[model samples]
Target chain A: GDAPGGAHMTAQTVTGAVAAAQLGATLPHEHVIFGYPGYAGDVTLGPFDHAAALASCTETARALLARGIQTVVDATPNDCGRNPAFLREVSEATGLQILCATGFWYEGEGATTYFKFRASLGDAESEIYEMMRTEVTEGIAGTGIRAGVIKLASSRDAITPYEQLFFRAAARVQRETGVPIITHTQEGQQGPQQAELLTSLGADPARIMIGHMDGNTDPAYHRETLRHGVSIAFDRIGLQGMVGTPTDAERLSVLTTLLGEGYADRLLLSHDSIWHWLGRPPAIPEAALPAVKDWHPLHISDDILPDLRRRGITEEQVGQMTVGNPARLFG
Target chain B: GDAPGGAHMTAQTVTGAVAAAQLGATLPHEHVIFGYPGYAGDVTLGPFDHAAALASCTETARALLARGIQTVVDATPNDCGRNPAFLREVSEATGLQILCATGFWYEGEGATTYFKFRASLGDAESEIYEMMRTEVTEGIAGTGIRAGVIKLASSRDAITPYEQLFFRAAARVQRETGVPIITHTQEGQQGPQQAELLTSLGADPARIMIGHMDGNTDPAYHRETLRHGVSIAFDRIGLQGMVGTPTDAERLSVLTTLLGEGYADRLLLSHDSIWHWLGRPPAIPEAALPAVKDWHPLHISDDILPDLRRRGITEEQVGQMTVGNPARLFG
Candidate 1:
């Protein structure tokens, strides 16, 4: 794969266009707001409050800006209450580059019947391809807010046929538009599966990011996913003790091991923290608060960077993870 | 109107059923989650993280509990991502009595095409009536979470046909179920309009709450609305310096004036603060934070109540507004 500084391209943002080089200190995967869809006629997940959410996300954007974060890629998919108009307002309000995504999450539990039924309708690939292409080239749902990235995901164990259809659909968008594709891996299991599917489907592996790879503790697993030449997001820093996910310390161990193994140039970092959530209140027990409280975007710069520095990881490596690598995805 | 203990009635809570008298120190109009619908097919406002939202709301509910608040009525409507299951989770987690609502907001902008298009379908009132009745009797969206109150609203100036249809529909539900009706008034306008319309349509004024009366400045306006025998909610306490609404001081002044005029039995107090919001960040400028920072559930107990006490409002009067009035709504 071509290293950073090979070329400069433009990345579309919620507020319009920006040079890929200008997307400095980026969090590759994070959500300002995640509106997970409910079943048919179920208002359980959302009819989200636009005004309050806008306020909350703006406050978070300001906090990230205070930590010198220049860009945040909001990976909320089309069905998950992804509001380009609201993202535009937040980007304009904070002067921070914000990128909206166009794609679907994992097909099994992550997808709603609306998407499931739609995927089953007429040449699923073509239908979804058009949806993603229109979002990147024209605008999202006629709001004139263009998406900068294509977000895709699969199940934990394997890529189902439905999930494969979406991957190919996203691949077609990537092939045509040169837009990047990012993904969600369940417990870090299926990164290789995602990498294999997208790359086999004609996506440029260099332009795809296999997300949540840090949730797994095994460096060999990470290596296997990276073997396909795609970048990996060691996102979800500081989130610990959730079932099947690693702690910040364990993640740091895995991250440093991979960096030590020379994968630093392919790494991107984030907390995957949902700053403002909609729908009913989440049902996290009281004991999980301490581990979850510091899981914001700033944890990387404030907590993990210092730890990485203590472990003798170079500033250049940090720059590659935070700045250089993300730039290449857009470029 | 009768006193609080005159009869015991069941108020359905997220935790389970509770006697209306057990709904102590209540905030009549607050939201755990609020997702306003977008114009067309956009679910922009929400499909929030149920797990994360539960955590945030439990934290807020705990804070309110520490301030002696035993219950909170989530006023989010069906179209706006109202999740009774999640509310029940929050209630169970925090040991707070959480009451969910069944009805509609102002039809103009607060509603989405889902409701608007549905309203245009077959005997609109009957359709809406069935929706509301199903929520109360069967459960919300088949989650088996029954609604305890009937929530309805109108716009600022006048009730539109669609808004009227919702009001009439809600009134039908109320007539059958004996559930109380709550409302939203823009900038203090339309309180009287809501009162007259509901009462004229056979809803008992004593079973109605004319919300956001604190948004209006004129005491005469407040008096005229109360003339129909409905309760009024000073529900926006601690929210100051918004474009069209009054300050906490102004709200305090109106409230004290009403109390002085012996309307204590028909007054409810709350901060309509949304605990967690989902969307792109809100567009509130940084300058507004200082004025709006104290807008939380505990603001009434920690700040407003003490201020009222200093201003010569008695503990009994406070109890009447905070406990007796809210209990009466459910009772």
Candidate 2:
């Protein structure tokens, strides 16, 4: 969930390179596509219309650039938000360095490779190793979108064996490529398990940024992640506060408390902004908006940085989460 | 959330009687209104209108009563869905008995008395005693519908102090009124924590039914609730293969196994259906279909019963959960 290292182009589009140049300090937990749980049994792999996707990314990148976000870490993974060329094209058009990811989707596709075949897999592990190798050495599935990091997710309690395998693969890739890892906590509380798994695989926990950190009951969980050398993500900031109804302020306060507790160096923020991607002008805004008519609090240029400023959080702390940490790893 | 218990009403209609002479099994979980987080901030005191809800309830009840269901639990709680007059009218018109619920909502309402006051006091041990006196003996803040059961909820983890207060209140009410308790589980696995909390408060686990047990990750969790002498409710049954996309078939297969394992006496089933409860249907077709369409598999009456039949579950087993179990708890 950290920001980008440096700007790069998408395999699917040349415009992404131009976009990345303009992006300054950015939030990386946002998504382009969400929830592709398995191989789209219906998706016919054909000539993808990259130019159009790149154009969309260009508009987004320009927005980020206008807001002074130079590095944009594209958090789209295989099933939910996976699109490397899309990131590249966006970067090309907007000049915002777009760091893509390398990892299997959740256990559905990776399960066979990780959970079921884990024990019987030295050759299979090597095959996964090759996949990671291709991403780092060549590009994501040879599509030419170099991964800036690895991604993983877990829901309730423990990591699934399938997730475990994905973590192992991600860790191997991290170790091999020096690329950092990013985590998605689907529900909450599972970040600990994911962190434990990734760290056990020899990936630097400090380099990992756990996303969706606000989805659980325990603020101590977020505190603990920081204690373990991992970064924190307060994405979905908008969806938490709407109209007169705001339940997530407690979580926001929790993250603020963590930052106040000297963990500021490891905190990243975003609205996990997925706009028009789901439908034009998302039928409902992010967690922040009380009503649909509300503008997204983290529309990059529109709200996040402005809101953070209004809250009296210094620009430097924002830089640590949105710029410094991400560029240090991805750059 | 849990299924509502014997004979009740909602906020929309005020006066009515729900006797077997009028209607068949009313799904108490069926809400006249529901929204995420803080969507129910405007709930006013109620004398409900049965003229409207009964029409919908009648059609569903007709389908089930034709197959021998003569009662329905309107699970909507007092805080969100209490309509006694509505139930009385529906019963008078349809020849069925409707059960209603009395309980608290989730954490988002912390500013109000439901959970917020509970969390602040943290010493709600005695406060629950007061609630028991008022709700069970004195009458719900003065509404006349005598509550037959208690309901509670836990958000993402074990139980919030707010929920703790609710469970304690339910336990005290049970002690004073001999009414049983039901609960709403957020992620499904929190049932164990809920049961533990109530039982610890001297509430009879046997008289307690963990609702939304269907959402648990495995049969083990559901079966264990039954093993603990608490009824395990598969509230999302209709949503499984039909109403929503096919939920893991394991939800039913597990319940079937629990039934086979001889806990049918400790099992309950409902769709947790909230048909047109809100003014509009959910965006997802499958989600909305469960609320209205006859073909959806997730509607307990339309989908669960048939699916159980398809899976070779005997009618007796289903009855034990649907009829026998609730009767023992409420009657």
Candidate 3:
């Protein structure tokens, strides 16, 4: 079986090379710490209390590691504090594998001034394409930590011209590096369009996963996205009513329907939770506090999977969504 | 003139208390640094890098102070990274008198979750009113640096129900404290409405200023707001073409019309420039960079005032706007 080091599929994780098979029971979308693009300007509460974050995130990682989450695909974009060195430190400290994503968020809320500014010089496409590729092939920001996944996103309903620039570049890099691609679908919008664009732009469907599908409860929407032969992530599993997403009970109803319909191999699960929030923690308004009661890293392991088994889901089906699909996609 | 220590109005500045007569050529509506609400969620560029910000802001303060600018009203809402201690440091370090504001931005772009959530249980209004009053009557967050202004904002074309809540509470505080109120009118859309609502709620018209009036080019819009007897801030003097505002030439044209029509005493001037941008500086897109060539705090002293003298506007009117009006308002 030891034919060669890169014989089958390799994942460029924060702790160096990880074989796809070794990345077991992974969370495909998560963040060790994340801030929106403009967060650095908040001098009152920022840039970071490094010691506090390191301790807090260390605790979060150990919790996941204790619960058998062997790998976490940190979906924080380059513009959103995708700290390779920080992730590497956590991975090494806890032995929990971490994969960083190299890309930008959707233009609307993304730190898009750079690439958009680059567009003014007529080399934004090349600049973006090479940035992703360089991070994958070389390293991120000279940290010597290569990213395993390429993150991309589109606005609701349509992919703007600016987003298309990243899409076109991502597809070319995907074809070149054979790395997996994950996307942020705004409130579950453009989930189908994302698949269509990535696949049409030459990205392999099996290597693509559309994130935030949990934001939408429509089985019709799920079926349409699955028809493209790609995967979907109900990653916002523990979060409820955020940006108008339905309850977990409603999410489970739609998820179970898809599992029985022979689509288990194309689904991934995650909490989309940020272990450490930089600057001021969102003052979880009393009106929205209950929504985040279960919005933590362990909700799926502690509640969802346990309940799924009681509700007629086979162990194999659970393992496949949790472990099998991620291995195959990363490979 | 010196009948007693309490004989005249006093300004609560970052460095210490300042008599209104000592608050010379003042930029009544400006910011030392600011970010939109939710910017703190961006770890990709956050929280704040102190050294760089200090250096950058020190430079900006020195530039303004060098140009006969004696006071700067830092209109950063508490919800948008209002840092009293930092402003104090800058003032003490650079000899630039700084006045901090206590309040929130417009609900749409503001950090309203805290109060909005509080409202679900029926305490938001009281909580908000006290926060503003506490900072004014006592000190802001235990820094012993009292706020000198109350900042409020309305949404485009209308003030939302959420905004009205702030207006109601702010008016009560204004009546109690007699502190000045500065308002953000979305793209100059609610300038008239802002003036009417604040004055009707029993706030002194002489003590309120509606900001960003430069975003609208119509002299008709200018007259409507000025008719309310509150001041107007062409604060965005050098910035143009941002959020769809007209050129400085256009702002100048409308400005001169109001000045000649006997409204110069009710106007103030400054550039709404952030000395240090936290996280990633807005890359001043090629389309927008030209809009900023003169958007620094020095624009009023550097270009606008020089041209005003040549345009038949007298030195007495200039001093009244740059110094006289601010002293009266802050007093």
Candidate 4:
């Protein structure tokens, strides 16, 4: 007889994850592993390096601790980038509960990278459901890493067959896990499309965060995304505000207008910042950075928060993106 | 028998005498008179020469004729610099329709200069309604310049007593003449509120266009206005690109997204281009020139049509905004 194995089907009490796990606040869409350049940058392909990755985690944790930011979800998945030990190291160093993610990126990358000759690799649909089930019930890779959320993206880097696979897989996983899905989209007005695909997959609007939507600063696109009930990432505000930038005031204006229009609870503000080694060249020129390097120079996560405050954002309002709303989702 | 008055009510087809009229398009938010001081820092608040203004109108009409732009609605109301003879001069010079307006500004400068005791005036609501009704029906102060859209704003300055009473009056008149109400808003999130006030007062949303909405670029504000079924105006694109310049990309992006999200029928695209004198400095700035100029500096209405054509925006969609949509609301 098959091993009798059905797990609890009820939703976990996420309040415990929010309160006792680590209180103050959380950044919903930070990344540990971002691409699949091999399978166009899949993190699952190589012989993993835990020690080097863990050290990187320690540095990030120290930064968060310095800023009084309590916990962060290490939003890397197998197809995207999932390193539990990295988050674990950060958790140990900074005392911030580090929750990691488990999911696939947009699809085509999956067939060659993860499904290549793996024994009993179910059809794309089945693999998605089973993976979500494993993360929610049995834990990721049977390791005690329970991903706090799922991650995904759409690359304008030339639409690939692999990317399509990631999109399909994300839909399947969302069906199985009530966990919200976080995505990265090329700033080409792909936000509403993300919502359309997710809703069609039967995912709840409240359970989705269409990632990296700061590209096009049009009200119509933003509203359509809101109309679908998904939160939006104003991540990368610093990059968007660099001098001579095309989307500068447009980004700030979007935040102000959307907040006034009453979607405060659904707005997620972040830097989409990545900390480099002590002597690395910044991805953007130093002159381009806004005068807000108190946190990280390239990706000042704190600027939009404090700048927004200077521009009349209240504490209650800022807390919605940084603490309140995130706590609800992460929980 | 009752002062030649229809005691019940008479449904009248409103026409313009001095503004854009007959065989051409009219921009209801353009300025031929006053503008905010903050915007026109170096501009002269002048004694407008009717003949000179008529010459400028002829020039605008010449360009319109070249591009098939026939008439225009000079949005400047009495408080802004409304001169019925100026409309007449332009109408005769250009042989095109010219619709003039007859409302007051929100408050502050124009109110101070035009009214005996502007602050003490208790809701100029009824008198304003009758004045607009007369202009649309019998013609402007007997100059035979008929008014088209009721034009006004919410705040006189950036401050809040700040709400609008002119919209209420305009809506009341619209109830009689079937004329649409076109309005300007504060350099803030005043468009949606003004729209709500207009519609809530029984004005038909199908016949209302909230001008100067470019000032409020939040997706939520746009969504709310569109949700209420009111059209939007990206008025005065020339003020500054830094403050929500309605670029071709911004236009196409908004149009595409709204189309995708099923809100296409509620859109209107125009640059509230306030023409200045040629050779001499325009009454407004070169910067204050409507963002959409006559196809000379890259014909926007013309170039944009082609851009949309190439960017997957259908002829049907463009027609909806340029032809069908405007006709439904304004005609």
Candidate 5:
């Protein structure tokens, strides 16, 4: 009854608005469009076929719909290929609700050239606050598509100076707008710091999610993160073999451990699956294919939940992780 | 008249067999799938959504088809995300001949771990030869999907020892199977070396293509490469901002100069555009976006060709680079 929602706790989606309770079986950290920069390959020419990208994203949505997914929070940050227009199209085509995010990804070296330069040019917090607040209140890039979530990220190590500024700005925005803030963590090392920083800066711990925690296989780390009253997203299931990340099996084992410890309501699950990525093909390397062949949003609905049931996870626990937990987070 | 193909010239394609002569307006050095190992970001999870990736590739193929492109040589190598099954699907979907490559990328740290470890165990050339030859003769990894080209690459300044072995193996395969060898050169510096090594090993220069030669803008370098009697790929048309690479304007000027010097028949034009990349979003940084906003396979046909015509490039020259040249290489 102390959950953050009231009668007015509605979520803004790509197509108008929907009640937080109606966002059934939501995949909170998935991406319909991810065009981040500073990747290692030849990204000079992007894979920006709007029609094809839309078609691909629509297919992902349909698959999610088939799996009883009603909403997807496309957690693409502002600097990435976060197209509100495309999100709307996918929603309209599939009759699925899509929530987009405002803010920026972690300002690491590769993904932060623009954000860092922009931060250098002015008062960093003021600039970021104005940008994020405008998106939550007004719209993203004047499309009248208000962001439902404020996406933020932290580096693998301690929060860098720029990331700290971003955290402060996000805290301010969350306080002002009541919009939830989700985050990216490199290999799950920074979850505690993320929660501490946000909550310390006046962000409601209930309105924060520490993402990619599945990348870390430690239940203790997760428990510490939950100490701050923020939810942890086991978002990268089926994504093994990435540098310093855990396998889905390991993640599932950790999930079981955490659930057994009765942290069910304080957790979220997602695949961080990229439905439509831009640039060249051969997106997965051959050697790494075996580990990630089934790494999609559907992996949760099709494999993980069933596997969880087989592992003695109850239907109630599943509901809490999948349906009730996301509702509470959004609420 | 004595090129690589004649009455006996046939190319293995994802959509089964095709006469090399029928491969019209080919993009010789493009990648339909390119997930190399140890690449920055989360390649461990990979971008392996078949339906989504297929949709993305099909979109690019359709665009290429709209511009009269009949074939794409998927230059992704063995260790990267080179899936014959996936290529076949793209070809079937788009009605374009997708010719996959066999061999390895430049034996650098990122893409060569498997090759390097294998090279350490036995005779390196023997191991590489068997792998490449089997991909061509018996089909890749027993998928019954044969590779149509041998792809090799070298470093910017010098050919590393591992790269030399790959070159040797590629040359041996080419000599035995009569398949052409396409190569990657860093900044166009290694074209002459590629030509020299391939020719010294008794491989025909006529069957060798020095790729990414357009990365260099020196007309003298282009002239020297042409002197080897091997064609050079001015691929990477829409790609700029890569370290030590030429801008499209500079590339076009070099192209015009080379064409004026009567080396038009010894060149190939492609965008090296990647339509459906995998991994997290923001595939390219925003700093690089300006240089490559229009970098796609269709850019050549839609923008570059018309621009060439305006610059007094003859239809014959365009035909030579786009149609006749690519045909001859595959043929």
Candidate 6:
């Protein structure tokens, strides 16, 4: 903790660390550039344009700063086109402390063949933990920039046994380094299970955040997840109608009910907006345009807050969800 | 054919054209860099270093030119990390003819999800044919470098309908332009079926070559495939002890027997050597040394041909396999 580089005892960003409170109104779940796992393999069809991506993501970071978002915890996991150097470039360009994750994504969309091969060999759990631990303790690949968070995820309904290994690896890394943890809930499923499993393995519940909970609209599901003593993100906000998810209107209704029950401190918010897509972004047809019109990071600052206020939620309550809650989680 | 650019009636190298007759000692199946479909997704682990790959593959190209291998058909299929610009650099640098393929790899280990989605939508066959025909007629993804071969493949035994779409697309593309066909037979299976299938779809029997026949060692099976009036490639020549294939000694024996039965003119040869791997090369352990000792492009020139000579096979017969047969197929 006494290292001169401040690698520990601070929030790690691509440009290095900031004291946890320095992360002003941090949007804790997002991607600067996320291509699905197979995009790289299709160079002829969709080779990643680094020069184009850098310019695009830099513009996005400036946009986030335009809305007063000082830090963005890029939840792009390893094997999902998570470029540490690329993230560092965006961070340096915009002064947006871009914190990268040091964990695997959910199995369905992840590069698990290598891990599966390791599992078949023996002690893959230890191997995975060793890799994640190195990223936190040392740095990702050879970039010399350490990961700030342990991001892991589960499939719908339950954490599969294979995914459980990643959960354990994240828990072990978080325990050793005092780094916070964030996780994915597939299709709004497995939020509560991710909370209980990580906490059961001795992870600090206060530092754990479950992402994409906005995929589910039910107040009971979000409230049930909060009882596990972990924060749940309405991240993936504004992605309504894109992937069978609900509108930000429906999300506001769910939140207004949950906030009345005094759970604002246990909530966090972000857009999970992807600034640069790997392939061409999914063709949003003309009919789906209205649903996705307010689907960028700017949506929260420009539009959604007024909607939340209109539904009787105070600005301090929204601030507590964005600023106070995120600061506490990283702190 | 009359254009100043010479778009047709010539063998398409990465740099442009060579008369099909000028493509001397052409190795009909090989790769400069072939990563399986998923390597690109793991950028943190195996980001494609273009400078490093260009230096490495150019070194391999120089080595091949030194050994008198004039041309290499890079059989790296679409969706399998086939980089046309990278191939062009190798060609321009070494003056080696590099012919790229414009078809899908086999059903498994290929990027078929995109095509499958198109199929579910409607007229994926036409969409697929359009893409391949464009690469043949126009160029690949704005590189202005057209693919020379229509490479397609079948599964283990019978061709799956999904795979059959690629075969028919190749057939249709060949029927339009005079580009030849090369195919994959999984684990040495389906050579006969691939031969008959492509031929039945109105492809020229003489120009179509079935690849990976070295995986199957039976003389009757070889004869059955050859009887379909198409050339068969023992191209996976040196990978003897790897992947359940027979020894090069066994491959030599099969050749001696088959050549005695007058099959030399119908056979083509090459090693499916990978010059630069995307992530990392497979571990060739100590016990497997000799089996893979001659497992490169040089094996055909260095060791196998001499052994074939000692077994009473003539040099002219070997030329018929390497030079005469490949020229005739492309011609």
Choose the strongest candidate by TM-score. Answer: 6
Per-residue lDDT for A173 in model 1? 82
Q: Name model 2 segments beyond 4 Å from true.
A: A1-331, B1-29, B32-54, B57-64, B108-115, B118-129, B240-248, B279-281, B285-302
What lDDT does each candidate get? 0.77, 0.55, 0.81, 0.55, 0.77, 0.78
* Segments in model 4 whose C-alpha atoms lie over 4 Å from true places: A1-331, B1-28, B32-52, B113-123, B156-163, B242-248, B277-299
lDDT of 6 by residue, A1-331 (tens): 1111112357778888788689888888988888665554334555578899889888888987998888888998786778889899888877888888877776665656556544644666876787778787788877788888888988886798779988888778777777888888888788888888988997877778888888888778888888888888888778877656788878888888888999988888888888887753455557877777777888887787778888799989989887888777775
* Residues B53-99, model 4: lDDT tens digits: 66766676667656655545567645333555655656566665555
Best by DockQ: 6
Candidate number with the higher DockQ (2 or 3): 3
Better of 1 and 2 by lDDT: 1
What is the CAPRI rating of model 3's predicted complex? incorrect
Query: Which sequence of candidate numbers ranks them by TM-score, best first?
Result: 6, 3, 1, 5, 2, 4
Q: Provide i-RMS per model in Å.
A: 14.1, 23.1, 7.4, 33.8, 13.2, 4.0
Docking quality (DockQ) of candidate 3: 0.09
Docking category for candidate 4? incorrect
Ranking by DockQ: 6, 3, 5, 1, 2, 4
DockQ of 2: 0.01
Candidate 6 chain A lDDT trough over 10 residues, lowest sum: A1-10
Evaluating just chain A, the predictions reach TM-scores of: 0.93, 0.77, 0.96, 0.75, 0.94, 0.94
Better of 4 and 6 by lDDT: 6
Instruction: Report per-prediction Cα RMSD to one decimal.
Output: 20.4, 16.5, 5.4, 25.3, 11.8, 5.1
lDDT for each residue of candidate 3 in B162-237, tens digit (9 for 90 to 100): 8888898898888887888898878878999899998898888878899999989888998999888889999888
DockQ of each: 0.02, 0.01, 0.09, 0.00, 0.03, 0.21
Better of 3 and 5 by lDDT: 3
DockQ: the better of candidates 1 and 4: 1
- Report the candidate with higher lDDT, 2 versus 3: 3
